[PDB]
Amino acid sequence: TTDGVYRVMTRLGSTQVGVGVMQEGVFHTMWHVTKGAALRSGEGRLDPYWGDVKQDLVSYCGPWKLDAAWDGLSEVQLLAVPPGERAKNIQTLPGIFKTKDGDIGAVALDYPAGTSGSPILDKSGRVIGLYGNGVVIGSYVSAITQGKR
């Protein structure tokens, strides 16, 4: 329930399959991480509420709450939570995905697959999107994927 960034774990032994953001009582992650499966948190269960394969996003306990967006000029920070590693902030200037439906911020950062769902932050600390859906150019580039509030 508590605000913050979280590992998404699965069970012979445990593995980290992704990362997500708890904000305003709603857990936010990428569809490809959980496929909408229910999530255990302590003794409680988090049930899915909304999901969309094309956006590659899912929310639990309520509607998607994150709505800040990259300003197109400023450096941002990936709050990476790699498997087995302490949460760490990686600052970068996003590039741009140019699409027929408009431009999308993108970060040219390559972390392990279990980092998918890590939040990208603006200077005010607001989550402007999640990391882990992207393209290859041998170098991976992630869209800054933000939902709609």
Partner: protein
């Protein structure tokens, strides 16, 4: 079964390592949520 563990606060860090380029790419997004390059 899937479960979550808290890993930290959502905060900007002033002492953050700085890296990575800022490429500009033409891309398309298909119905399955997959990005692909366009030329």
């Amino acid at each position: 079964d899937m479960y979550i563990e808290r890993a930290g606060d959502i905060t900007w860090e002033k002492d953050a390592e700085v890296t990575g380029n800022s490429p500009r790419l033409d891309v398309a997004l298909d119905e399955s949520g997959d990005f692909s390059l366009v030329e």
